[PDB]
Scaffold this active site. Structure first.
Site, PDB file in Angstrom:
ATOM      1  N   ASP A 172       6.260  -3.676  -7.753  1.00  0.00           N
ATOM      2  CA  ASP A 172       7.198  -4.315  -6.842  1.00  0.00           C
ATOM      3  C   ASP A 172       7.792  -3.281  -5.894  1.00  0.00           C
ATOM      4  O   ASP A 172       8.114  -2.161  -6.297  1.00  0.00           O
ATOM      5  CB  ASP A 172       8.306  -5.015  -7.628  1.00  0.00           C
ATOM      6  CG  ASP A 172       9.305  -5.719  -6.730  1.00  0.00           C
ATOM      7  OD1 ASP A 172       8.919  -6.704  -6.066  1.00  0.00           O
ATOM      8  OD2 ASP A 172      10.477  -5.289  -6.690  1.00  0.00           O
TER       9      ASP A 172
ATOM     10  N   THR B 132      10.481  -7.868  -0.301  1.00  0.00           N
ATOM     11  CA  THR B 132      10.726  -6.439  -0.453  1.00  0.00           C
ATOM     12  C   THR B 132       9.685  -5.604   0.285  1.00  0.00           C
ATOM     13  O   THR B 132       9.980  -4.994   1.312  1.00  0.00           O
ATOM     14  CB  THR B 132      10.742  -6.024  -1.936  1.00  0.00           C
ATOM     15  OG1 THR B 132       9.720  -6.735  -2.645  1.00  0.00           O
ATOM     16  CG2 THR B 132      12.095  -6.333  -2.561  1.00  0.00           C
ATOM     17  N   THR B 133       8.467  -5.578  -0.246  1.00  0.00           N
ATOM     18  CA  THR B 133       7.433  -4.683   0.258  1.00  0.00           C
ATOM     19  C   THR B 133       7.046  -5.020   1.691  1.00  0.00           C
ATOM     20  O   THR B 133       6.575  -4.144   2.424  1.00  0.00           O
ATOM     21  CB  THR B 133       6.196  -4.746  -0.641  1.00  0.00           C
ATOM     22  OG1 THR B 133       6.596  -5.029  -1.987  1.00  0.00           O
ATOM     23  CG2 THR B 133       5.450  -3.421  -0.616  1.00  0.00           C
TER      24      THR B 133
ATOM     25  N   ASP C 287      11.981 -12.126  -9.604  1.00  0.00           N
ATOM     26  CA  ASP C 287      11.369 -12.463  -8.326  1.00  0.00           C
ATOM     27  C   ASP C 287      10.751 -13.854  -8.325  1.00  0.00           C
ATOM     28  O   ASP C 287      10.364 -14.341  -7.258  1.00  0.00           O
ATOM     29  CB  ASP C 287      10.303 -11.428  -7.959  1.00  0.00           C
ATOM     30  CG  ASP C 287      10.884 -10.045  -7.734  1.00  0.00           C
ATOM     31  OD1 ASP C 287      12.110  -9.878  -7.908  1.00  0.00           O
ATOM     32  OD2 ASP C 287      10.116  -9.126  -7.381  1.00  0.00           O
TER      33      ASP C 287
HETATM   34  N1  LIG Z   1      -3.693 -15.509  -2.745  1.00  0.00           N
HETATM   35  C1  LIG Z   1      -3.231 -14.855  -1.654  1.00  0.00           C
HETATM   36  N2  LIG Z   1      -3.943 -14.822  -0.507  1.00  0.00           N
HETATM   37  C2  LIG Z   1      -3.503 -14.177   0.590  1.00  0.00           C
HETATM   38  N3  LIG Z   1      -2.331 -13.520   0.632  1.00  0.00           N
HETATM   39  C3  LIG Z   1      -1.514 -13.470  -0.446  1.00  0.00           C
HETATM   40  C4  LIG Z   1      -1.931 -14.151  -1.677  1.00  0.00           C
HETATM   41  N4  LIG Z   1      -0.952 -13.945  -2.575  1.00  0.00           N
HETATM   42  C5  LIG Z   1       0.011 -13.197  -1.979  1.00  0.00           C
HETATM   43  N5  LIG Z   1      -0.329 -12.915  -0.705  1.00  0.00           N
HETATM   44  C6  LIG Z   1       0.475 -12.119   0.255  1.00  0.00           C
HETATM   45  O1  LIG Z   1       1.004 -10.947  -0.374  1.00  0.00           O
HETATM   46  C7  LIG Z   1       2.319 -10.677   0.117  1.00  0.00           C
HETATM   47  C8  LIG Z   1       3.201 -10.114  -0.992  1.00  0.00           C
HETATM   48  O2  LIG Z   1       4.507  -9.846  -0.495  1.00  0.00           O
HETATM   49  P1  LIG Z   1       5.619  -9.221  -1.473  1.00  0.00           P
HETATM   50  O3  LIG Z   1       5.370  -7.738  -1.585  1.00  0.00           O
HETATM   51  O4  LIG Z   1       5.672 -10.070  -2.719  1.00  0.00           O
HETATM   52  O5  LIG Z   1       6.987  -9.448  -0.657  1.00  0.00           O
HETATM   53  P2  LIG Z   1       8.401  -9.069  -1.327  1.00  0.00           P
HETATM   54  O6  LIG Z   1       8.342  -7.569  -1.474  1.00  0.00           O
HETATM   55  O7  LIG Z   1       9.429  -9.561  -0.334  1.00  0.00           O
HETATM   56  O8  LIG Z   1       8.393  -9.819  -2.638  1.00  0.00           O
HETATM   57  C9  LIG Z   1       2.852 -11.985   0.686  1.00  0.00           C
HETATM   58  O9  LIG Z   1       3.438 -11.774   1.974  1.00  0.00           O
HETATM   59  C10 LIG Z   1       1.658 -12.915   0.779  1.00  0.00           C
HETATM   60  O10 LIG Z   1       1.433 -13.327   2.130  1.00  0.00           O
END
Ligand SMILES: Nc1ncnc2c1ncn2[C@@H]1O[C@H](COP(=O)(O)OP(=O)(O)O)[C@@H](O)[C@H]1O
Ligand SMILES: Nc1ncnc2c1ncn2[C@@H]1O[C@H](COP(=O)(O)OP(=O)(O)O)[C@@H](O)[C@H]1O
Ligand SMILES: Nc1ncnc2c1ncn2[C@@H]1O[C@H](COP(=O)(O)OP(=O)(O)O)[C@@H](O)[C@H]1O
Ligand SMILES: [Mg+2]
Lengths: 99, 426, 101, 525, 47, 51, 51, 526, 78, 47
Positions: free
Chosen positions: H59, H92-93, H390
């Site tokens: 994360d 976050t990321t 989360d």
């Molecule tokens: N099955 C999938 N196919 C395409 N993109 C995905 C899939 N699962 C997650 N993602 C992408 O991965 C990203 C993960 O973001 P994340 O690091 O969880 O944000 P945060 O740090 O705010 O939690 C999301 O923006 C999403 O668009």
């Protein structure tokens, strides 16, 4: 006593008679063991100056044993029982040696 | 009777506790491998208070050494007279606390404190009348705040009515070791004003300026630090270890030190403070040592007694002296400096003396008493606790072990209530 | 973002409710502004409790909370719903606000 | 690196670098802990900084008391901590699966493949390994002769098979007389006392309790038959009021009246005890034992000794739970409702002194439901061998009673599970074909280590064992005496179902997470 | 207490450093030569 | 809800109708800058309405 | 870290040693109480008056 | 030794291009750390703590909090991820990569002799157009449907480590928010931190983890005679002690008579029996307090068949007050019938790994629940605890704002074509920094193909051509395979509050770090 | 705190840039002009410069005073 | 010039030692207990 200990004086009769009342209280306790025929009184703790005054008056010998394990071995020697309370009229828990 | 079991829990508790028994074994003349070398009932009567006599004449100190570190307590294993304790009084901890309060309670404390309570139970078998327990720890330490706060709460489930005399090493306002020191100081005191009755305040870094200026030490260390702390520890337990006219044990000290049970933070100290070369070129009289404890040059904490007001003053002297001159000298200060003393107490400074001289010094007095000097030190801890918690800095180190955001909120509300508790009579 | 800066017509107090049993939204509220610590009745330095009778012991111990709760019932029976305090409200006095709402 | 730019005192490990750190450290813990798996393992002498000897070969005590500072070794030690916390045995075999799940996966990741492709094959292999484990378990209705062979397997692997014949009678007979009628057996009802009397092969099973403290008065009876247990929680010693009161007296004659009056509340508690002894028809011997968790002053000890009442002091917290079930009384906290219904009964209460340290024994109860294993080891380090093996054996028979099925022994589970993954290897239909092969070869380390510690060949033994399994239907295993494939269900070598179930679950998740680590770094300064 | 990351496969140097990849070697060679281009950019031209 | 803290609001106060401003920013460095910039902006309109 | 551009917040946190430097730093502190936004322009004028 | 006549001693001064282009490289350095932790093909990053612990996570918030930096602009980016962690759950990321890319294109215009206020004024005009684009491509959500809410929380945990146990972790996180959704007065609130406690116990399997219908604590009974299994208990919550303590005064008793000392010791026993008689008037079964219980209080509750727990925490008392519906009272003589926790289900004192745990479960309608996590060790259970935090906060945003944005690259490409078509009517010097904001949004579909190993040239050329038409507009990047699949068929949907907070924080991070042209370091404070 | 590379710029060199460089060069020429400022005109005094060896040289010429100051500033050498 | 032998598989000790085998562990425990047998051999018996 064990909690605090405090003498409370409110008049002149309680101040002057307190010193003579303490000596008569200790005299009745040392002479209580002199009437039972005791000759040797062995204690574990300290001994006040008034206790030594009546021990030499009624002619009884005092033995100071600062160790508590040596006090338990003396009870198995003369056949006596260590009394946690102050001097009672001893019925049958006396010791008996020869010299 | 009136046996007291000693619990040295923490990293800083074992360093003080190593030299704590060096003063008792030297003043009482207790041989570490023989039987005794006493002279009269001033030293031989009060052996059974702090020691349990074994079969044959060997004396064993009623001491429990708790530490969450193998390397720290190995100096008290086979070092400066550390082979005299019981083998079960050496409870080691293979998992270090890491200077974290939440790790010593929920992770380390969930598996060790059931075994630490077994050592207090075995020590209480040889106690015909248990008077109380002492606890030397620190606020800026992991084991001192982890195994000092959880140990003082589980000991009340078995001893709810017995008195407690805790020794707390306060952090320094001058230097800092880590940023979680306001976190460890706030959480340990928040469960200390709940159900305890006595707590001292000793600052170790504040004593480096005392050894540099008064005791004439160029490069001080931890060995020179704990020498004068052991003189302060032996000054409180003087009438407890030696008989005399002014009989005052820990039961009589728990009542005549605090008018109120919550405001139980004292300022220990002693007098005089002489070096290794200028000691023999100084005479010690009765008004010389009695008037030195009130000034700021004889404080164990980084505080200022020149801007405060005391509540209860107790002093224990060392040596056969006339104790009627102590009360007449201190009564003249209460009339000219009445803003520093209590207005309704006719005898603020208590008297205590013994007939056993200390080690090195000829005459010596100690200073035990509470004032508003802890009030200005508790404001700086809550000031650092406010800025760190508002940014929520390093809260995942605590909340990951079992804490929460509401845990620090209740720890901040009652600690700031203690600031207003001292602010009434100031 | 900076476009979500609220203009609160009134006042925005930077504090918490404390006990998690009180209603956090009061409509048509009556604010009681007061500055004294709502804690147990502690006597001053000049007053001490010197009892000569053991039967009179428990009536003095209950009096430290009865005088305390006597103030909290006369400031709450007048329709006051919001109480602001610059001092300190201990855990015994927080029950009277949860019970009365 | 990016971490070197922000913090110059922060070490880091890259993608191909952090994989070599975790795998080579897992081989370091594997090569050390593989010399103690099974009965043919070697003893390890562990010396701390003080100088005390900790002679043991359990996988949990080896990993904790080892001078190692590595982040990979701290992850495996936490998984090994929970294996010895909830189910006892299964700690040495826990580390050897992780040591092979990372070594067999290194043969594919270094040869071009991605680490996530191997972890997708581990989940598909765990699903077949969990279904195959439910088909090989044997339900035997928790027979008392079955629990002997379950306890004998866990005790041999920690002792030299001369004490395993003695400790099995002390573990099986202890776990049966605790709870009945489908009740969860509490392990707090078994007390483990360390003595020094005779020898290591003299550990008996006391049907009652063994207290580590004796009578604190020289006039009390040392041997008491047909006793009445009065379990108390009151404080018979002198206590003061909560409010600081003190005393005030005028004359010296009123001084002795206050000392007599301050012990009146203390002696009122003692007068309730000595009147209970007169209400239980005391025209006989009629011994009385008061365990009395809180302390007793010597004034009340002298009063109880004149009536003939043995009074102990400073008992444990769980001594008011174990003795209450053993004596059948009621652990009271007050003397306001004293009655003969709250009294216990024991046929013999005696003490024994071992170097100025008394030990109170309570025996001869009707239905105790609380026992005590009396370990009498000669040395101090030999006491740690038996205590770590008793709790390894008590948690083995506790899982065999709670779970209704028994899992077979040494090679009757791991060899049959690896052969089931070969026939289901083309069932994944994708790139994770090599992930099931890496999981099947990692399960074969349990017959490989047991053939290596016994002195036999490693590859020559695994050919003959897999030949007898493919040409028959019996779950054949490893024999540590001859090397021939022998069935474990017939020779009396069993295992727990929850140990093998968690070995397929705790080792698999911790291997799929380590293989997906590529940024080992140290920051925060 | 605090653990640390040791060498992994080929840490055999006695005080020398090593760079591999695009971010540690290629992207750092670009940013180092960019500082020389921005240095002599002011002294370029008739002005 | 003020993004993982508790904040008490009083609406229009029924007597004087005062005002309070709650600022919203990205980090704590912007919020200290937004507080100083808003306090200097309040002092500008104060002197214009007075003088 | 304090990110600001006001003439009073910068010069208050910045340490000075020269006695002529403490006059201009205390000049910015007076502009907040008297006016409130006029606390970068006073420092540049008072230094150019000396130049 | 004469002192040197200096001014502003022991401090640094730095201005010009070394601060404007120096804060960009500090922002690019942090964005390259967590660049491999965005897509579903990400990997964990093992971290080491100064306390001795190990944080193995992927994360973006938990990684940056364990990094101690010395650069001042690097300290700003860590506080950005702390803001995104408290507002939303899975935001976050994505902000740290986007703020590093918006500053990457901002460094290009600083070399073109353009003022930084021109780029920020173009960033604020671009920020106001990114909010209006997401509100046009949104979709209303039926919050009453159970299967629709499971697809939202599954899209947020596909990146995390609980994607393998996706069928179990989605049902736990959905039932945790729907239990703690409490509304007393006219104000809806969801408190998933004070009431939804996530407790982890080492041992067992992860498949046996479930959200309990009630609370649980690690506390044993005070006395073995007390019952450990009550069918329907009447739980009474206390706050004060059941002991005898000293009052808040200077009370001292003068004892002159003989009967006075025995009377005070009897009045201490009668005071405890008075408050124990006041709690049994309502006929309870379970007494729970926060302070100690004396043995005199344990005796009166033993013969009255009352199970007493001793030292339950204050945060656990607030959590059990919502589950059982009890009132935490602080006065035993002021107990009422409304303060009794009726409606509580089965109470059982189980033992999990040689330690007793008090279970208060099977409640009728609890307003607070406890997620029981059981795994291999405390290392991976801290991962599931950080992933469920989360997973519960992304369900809180849908219940307060039921709008979904097509994630997985489809959100960033739908606005990057909207900023490109709107930039044709600019006709000014702010037109070219307005175009760079649409190019800076390309780093989110760039990261999803760089983590799975796909090509970034053949895919981004085809993905940019899919958004040239206004009909489809929802084509994203499939991180599982690596091709272009529509998000209406995959089911990857992100909430509106996640995507709005991502764009509002990444722009204003570039607003703050572009106005910095000077850095002073070396001074002290109080 | 900004420049922390793995390979530094040249060795350890410091270099000023822009408008603070030019005022640093102008103010440096003002200090070295004070050593020839009091030597102009018939009412102008001379100056005495002593080196490290103790050799005294009293003069008022600009070619004699400026060569004995041992100026190491780059702009002031002009 | 002169090379050296580093750690191989499990050298993770921070100042501790490790003994394994018949020569390094078993035979060294024999020679240590042999010196205690020769120590008290002179003080054995009436002479
Ligand atoms: N099955 C999938 N196919 C395409 N993109 C995905 C899939 N699962 C997650 N993602 C992408 O991965 C990203 C993960 O973001 P994340 O690091 O969880 O944000 P945060 O740090 O705010 O939690 C999301 O923006 C999403 O668009
Ligand atoms: N008598 C026996 N014959 C063959 N194999 C045995 C025997 N006893 C134990 N084993 C094997 O030794 C292995 C390890 O046993 P043990 O050391 O008790 O557990 P662990 O290695 O997990 O600590 C088991 O998997 C079991 O199959
Ligand atoms: N739109 C504008 N056009 C031209 N000049 C402006 C504009 N806005 C502000 N300024 C100038 O910028 C200056 C800012 O001064 P400032 O630093 O705020 O002074 P102080 O530090 O006293 O608050 C003002 O003197 C003003 O003349
Ligand atoms: Mg996510």
């Amino acid at each position: 006593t064990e909690t605090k200990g405090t003498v409370l004086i409110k008049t002149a009769e309680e101040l002057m008679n307190f010193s003579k009342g303490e000596e008569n209280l200790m005299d009745a306790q040392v002479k209580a063991i002199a009437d039972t025929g005791a000759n040797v009184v062995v204690t574990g703790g300290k001994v006040a100056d008034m206790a030594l005054h009546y021990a030499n008056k009624y002619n009884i010998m005092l033995v100071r044993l600062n160790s508590k394990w040596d006090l338990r071995r003396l009870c198995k020697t003369v056949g006596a029982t260590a009394l946690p309370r102050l001097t009672p009229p001893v019925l049958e828990e006396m010791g008996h040696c020869d010299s | 009777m009136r046996e007291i079991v000693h619990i040295q829990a923490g990293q800083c508790g074992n360093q003080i506790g190593a030299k704590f028994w060096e003063v008792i074994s030297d003043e009482h003349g207790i041989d570490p491998t023989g039987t005794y070398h006493g002279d009269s009932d001033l030293q031989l009567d009060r052996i059974s208070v702090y020691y349990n006599e074994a079969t044959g004449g060997k004396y064993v100190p009623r001491a429990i050494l708790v530490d969450l570190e193998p390397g720290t307590m190995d100096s008290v294993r086979s070092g400066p007279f550390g082979q005299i304790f019981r083998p079960d009084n050496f409870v080691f901890g293979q998992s270090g606390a890491g200077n974290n309060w939440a790790k010593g309670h929920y992770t380390e404390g969930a598996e060790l404190v059931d075994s630490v309570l077994d050592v207090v139970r075995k020590e209480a078998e040889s106690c015909d009348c248990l008077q109380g327990f002492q606890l030397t720890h620190s606020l800026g330490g992991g084991t001192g705040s982890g195994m000092g706060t959880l140990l003082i709460s589980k000991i009340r489930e078995e001893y709810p009515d017995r008195i407690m005399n805790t020794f707390s090493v306060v952090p320094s306002p001058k230097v800092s070791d880590t940023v979680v020191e306001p976190y460890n100081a706030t959480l340990s005191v928040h469960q200390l004003v709940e159900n305890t009755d006595e707590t001292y305040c000793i600052d170790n870094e504040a004593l480096y300026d005392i050894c540099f200026r008064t005791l004439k030490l160029t490069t001080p260390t931890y060995g020179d630090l704990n020498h004068l702390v052991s003189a302060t520890m032996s000054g409180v337990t003087t009438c407890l270890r030696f008989p005399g006219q002014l009989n005052a044990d820990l039961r009589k000290l728990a009542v005549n030190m605090v008018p109120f049970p919550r405001l139980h933070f004292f300022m220990p100290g002693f007098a005089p403070l002489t070096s290794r070369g200028s000691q023999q070129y100084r005479a010690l009289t009765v008004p010389e040592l009695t008037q030195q404890v009130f000034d700021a040059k004889n404080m164990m904490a980084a505080c200022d007694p020149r801007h405060g007001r005391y509540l209860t003053v107790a002093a224990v002297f060392r040596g056969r002296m006339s104790m009627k001159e102590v009360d007449e000298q201190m009564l003249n200060v209460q009339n000219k400096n009445s803003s520093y003393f209590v207005e309704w107490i006719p005898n603020n400074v208590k008297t205590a003396v013994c007939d056993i001289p200390p080690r090195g010094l000829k005459m010596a007095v100690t200073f035990i008493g509470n004032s508003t000097a802890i009030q200005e030190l508790f404001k700086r801890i809550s000031e650092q606790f406010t800025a760190m918690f508002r940014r929520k800095a390093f809260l995942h180190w605590y909340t990951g072990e079992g804490m929460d955001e509401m845990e620090f909120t209740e720890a901040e509300s009652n600690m700031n209530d203690l600031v207003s508790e001292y602010q009434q009579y100031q | 973002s900076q476009m979500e800066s609220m203009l609160i017509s009134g006042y925005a107090l930077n504090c918490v409710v404390g006990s998690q049993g009180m209603p956090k939204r009061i409509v048509n509220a009556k604010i009681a502004c007061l500055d004294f610590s709502l804690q147990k009745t502690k006597m001053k330095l000049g007053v001490q409790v010197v009892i000569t009778d053991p039967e009179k012991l428990d009536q003095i111990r209950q009096r430290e909370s009865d005088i305390t709760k006597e103030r909290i019932q006369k400031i709450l029976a007048t329709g006051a719903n919001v109480i602001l305090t610059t001092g300190g409200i201990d855990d015994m006095c927080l029950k009277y606000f949860v019970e009365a709402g | 690196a990016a971490v070197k730019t922000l913090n110059p005192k922060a070490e880091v490990a890259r993608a191909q670098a952090a994989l070599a750190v975790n795998i080579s450290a897992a081989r370091g813990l594997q090569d050390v802990l593989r010399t103690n798996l099974g009965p043919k393992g070697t003893m390890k002498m562990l010396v701390s900084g003080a100088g005390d000897i900790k002679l043991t070969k359990d996988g949990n005590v080896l990993l904790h008391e080892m001078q190692i500072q590595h982040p990979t070794a701290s992850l495996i030690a936490k998984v090994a901590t929970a294996q010895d916390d909830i189910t006892g045995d299964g700690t040495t075999s826990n580390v050897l699966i992780i040591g092979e799940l990372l070594k067999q996966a290194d043969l594919y990741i270094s040869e071009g493949l991605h680490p996530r492709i191997i972890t997708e094959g581990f989940e598909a292999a765990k699903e077949k390994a969990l279904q195959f484990l439910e088909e090989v378990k044997v339900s035997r209705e928790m027979d008392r002769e079955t629990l002997i062979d379950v306890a004998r397997t866990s005790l041999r692997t920690k002792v030299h098979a001369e004490l395993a014949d003695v400790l099995t009678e002390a573990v099986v007979d202890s776990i049966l007389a605790i709870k009945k009628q489908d009740e969860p057996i509490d392990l707090f009802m078994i007390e483990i006392m360390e003595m020094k009397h005779k020898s290591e092969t003299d550990t008996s099973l006391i049907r009652g309790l063994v207290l580590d403290h004796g009578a604190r008065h020289p006039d009390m009876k040392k041997r008491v038959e047909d006793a009445y247990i009065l379990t108390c929680n009151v404080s018979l010693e002198y206590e003061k009021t909560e409010v600081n009161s003190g005393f005030f007296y005028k004359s010296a004659e009123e001084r002795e009246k206050l000392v007599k009056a301050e012990r009146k509340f203390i002696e009122d508690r003692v007068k309730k005890i000595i009147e209970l002894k007169r209400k239980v028809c005391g025209d006989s011997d009629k011994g009385f034992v008061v365990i009395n968790q809180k302390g007793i002053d010597p004034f009340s000890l002298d009063a109880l000794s004149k009536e003939g009442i043995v009074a102990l002091r400073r008992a444990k917290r769980r001594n008011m739970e174990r003795l209450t079930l053993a004596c059948g009384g009621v652990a009271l906290n007050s003397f306001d409702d004293l009655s003969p219904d709250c009294l216990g009964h024991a046929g013999l209460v005696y003490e024994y002194t071992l170097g100025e340290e008394k030990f109170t024994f309570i025996e001869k109860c009707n239905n105790p439901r609380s026992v005590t294993l009396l370990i009498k080891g000669p040395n101090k380090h030999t006491l740690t061998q038996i205590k770590d093996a008793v709790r390894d054996g008590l948690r083995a028979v506790k899982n065999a009673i709670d779970d209704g099925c028994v899992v077979p022994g040494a090679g009757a589970v791991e060899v049959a599970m690896a052969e089931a993954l070969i026939k289901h290897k083309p069932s994944v239909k994708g790139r994770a074909q090599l992930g099931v092969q890496a999981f099947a070869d990692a399960l074969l380390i349990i017959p490989k280590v047991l053939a290596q510690n016994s002195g036999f060949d490693l590859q020559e033994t695994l050919v003959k064992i897999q030949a007898e399994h493919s040409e028959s239907g019996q779950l054949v295993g490893v024999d540590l005496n001859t090397g021939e494939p022998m069935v474990a269900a017939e020779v009396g070598v069993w295992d727990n179902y929850c140990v093998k179930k968690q070995l397929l679950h705790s080792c698999t998740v911790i291997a799929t997470n380590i293989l997906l680590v590529d940024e080992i770094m140290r920051a925060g300064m | 207490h605090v653990p640390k990351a040791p060498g992994f496969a080929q840490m055999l140097k006695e005080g020398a450093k090593h760079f591999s990849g695009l971010e540690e070697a290629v992207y750092r060679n670009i940013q180092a030569c960019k500082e020389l281009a921005q240095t002599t950019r002011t002294a370029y031209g008739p002005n | 809800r003020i993004c993982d803290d508790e904040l008490i609001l009083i609406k229009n106060t029924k007597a004087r109708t005062s005002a309070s401003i709650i600022l919203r920013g990205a980090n704590d460095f912007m919020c200290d800058e937004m507080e100083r910039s808003l306090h200097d902006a309040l002092c500008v309109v104060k002197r214009v309405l007075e003088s | 870290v304090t990110i600001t551009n006001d003439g009073a917040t910068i010069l208050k946190l910045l340490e000075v040693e020269h006695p002529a430097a403490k006059v201009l730093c205390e000049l910015a502190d007076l502009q907040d109480k008297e006016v409130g936004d006029g606390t970068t322009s006073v420092v540049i004028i008072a230094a150019e008056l000396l130049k | 030794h004469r002192p040197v006549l200096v001014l502003s001693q022991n401090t640094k001064r730095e201005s010009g291009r070394k601060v404007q282009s120096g804060n960009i490289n500090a922002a690019k350095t942090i964005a390259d750390i967590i660049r491999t932790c965005l897509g579903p093909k990400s990997m964990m990053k093992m971290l080491l703590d100064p306390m001795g612990g190990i944080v193995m996570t992927n994360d973006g918030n938990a990684i940056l909090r364990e990094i101690q930096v010395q650069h001042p602009a690097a300290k700003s980016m860590i506080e950005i991820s702390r803001t995104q962690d408290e507002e939303v759950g899975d935001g976050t990321t994505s902000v740290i990569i986007l703020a590093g890319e918006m500053l990457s294109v901002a460094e290009h215009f600083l070399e073109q002799q353009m003022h930084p206020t021109v780029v920020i004024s173009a960033y604020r005009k671009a920020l106001d157009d990114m909010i209006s684009t997401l509100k046009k491509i949104s979709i209303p959500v039926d919050i009453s449907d159970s299967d629709m809410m499971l697809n939202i929380i599954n899209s947020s945990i596909t990146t995390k480590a609980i994607s393998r146990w996706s069928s179990l972790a989605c049902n736990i996180a959905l039932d945790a928010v729907k239990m703690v959704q409490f509304e007393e007065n006219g104000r809806k609130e969801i408190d998933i931190k004070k009431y939804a406690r996530v407790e982890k116990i080492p041992g067992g399997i992860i498949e046996d983890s479930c959200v309990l219908r009630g609370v649980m604590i690690n506390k044993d009974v005070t006395h073995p005679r007390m019952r450990r299994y009550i069918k329907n208990p009447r739980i009474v919550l206390l706050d004060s002690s059941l002991e005898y303590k000293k009052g808040e005064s200077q009370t001292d008793i003068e004892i002159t008579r003989e009967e006075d000392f025995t009377r005070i010791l009897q009045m201490e026993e009668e005071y405890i029996q008075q408050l124990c008689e006041d709690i049994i008037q309502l006929k309870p079964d379970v007494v729970i307090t926060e302070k100690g219980i004396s043995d005199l209080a344990q005796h009166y509750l033993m013969r009255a068949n009352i199970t007493a727990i001793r030292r339950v925490r204050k945060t656990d008392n607030n959590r059990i007050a919502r589950a059982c519906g009890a009132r935490i009272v602080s006065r035993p003589e002021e107990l009422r019938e409304d303060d009794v926790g009726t409606g509580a289900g089965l109470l059982e004192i189980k033992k999990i790994g040689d330690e007793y745990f008090t279970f208060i479960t099977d409640c009728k309608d609890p307003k607070a629940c406890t997620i029981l996590l059981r795994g291999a060790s405390k290392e991976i259970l801290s991962e599931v605890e950080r992933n469920l935090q989360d997973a519960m906060q992304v369900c809180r945003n849908v219940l307060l704002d039921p709008q979904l944005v097509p994630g997985g690259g489809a959100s960033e490409m739908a606005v990057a074509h909207a900023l490109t078509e709107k930039s044709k009517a600019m006709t000014g010097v702010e037109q070219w920094p307005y175009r760079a904001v649409a190019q800076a949004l390309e780093v989110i579909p760039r990261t999803l193909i760089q983590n799975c190993g796909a090509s970034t040239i053949r895919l981004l050329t085809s993905l940019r051509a899919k958004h040239t038409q206004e009909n489809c507009e929802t084509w994203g990047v499939n991180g599982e395979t690596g091709t272009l699949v529509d998000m209406k068929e995959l089911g990857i949907w992100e909430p509106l509050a996640v995507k709005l907070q991502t764009y509002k924080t990444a722009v204003e991070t570039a607003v703050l770090l572009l106005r910095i042209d000077d850095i002073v370091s070396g001074h002290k404070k109080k | 705190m900004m420049p922390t590379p793995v390979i530094l710029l040249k060795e350890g060199t410091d270099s000023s840039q822009g408008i603070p460089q030019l005022v640093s060069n102008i103010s440096a020429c003002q200090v070295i002009a004070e050593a020839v400022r009091t030597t102009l005109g018939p009412r102008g005094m001379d100056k005495l410069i002593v080196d490290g060896r103790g050799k005294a040289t009293i003069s008022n010429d600009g070619a004699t005073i400026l060569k004995l100051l041992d100026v190491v500033h780059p702009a002031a050498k002009t």
